[PDB]
Nucleic acid binder design. Sequence first.
DNA 1: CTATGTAAACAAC
DNA 2: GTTGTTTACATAG
Length: 85
Amino acid sequence: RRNAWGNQSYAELISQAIESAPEKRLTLAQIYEWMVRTVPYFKDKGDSNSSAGWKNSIRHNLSLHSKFIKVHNEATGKSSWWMLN
DNA sequence: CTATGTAAACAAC
DNA sequence: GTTGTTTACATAG
Ligand SMILES: [Mg+2]
Ligand SMILES: [Mg+2]
């Protein structure tokens, strides 16, 4: 294992999360939820705040890679939708 | 040198 | 306390 959760890179995990959504878009909190619900290593980490290393790494990847695109979200108290490409 | 993971400064909310 | 962008640095290859 390249990482504690497997060989997937964070970009690959985020990509799988987005692709699993029916409308192919998820908010940042939803990407974290997908990790906690689906990746064994993260199953006992839902109780963490945003300073958690892995959450910071997710945010870093979303901004760094052009493959992740940010779209405005109409829902009043919710953040941006993240999509692929 | 590049890809990747990790940490943190910093803005804006 | 979160969301988002960014620099900085470490290491594997
Ligand atoms: Mg991006
Ligand atoms: Mg060393």
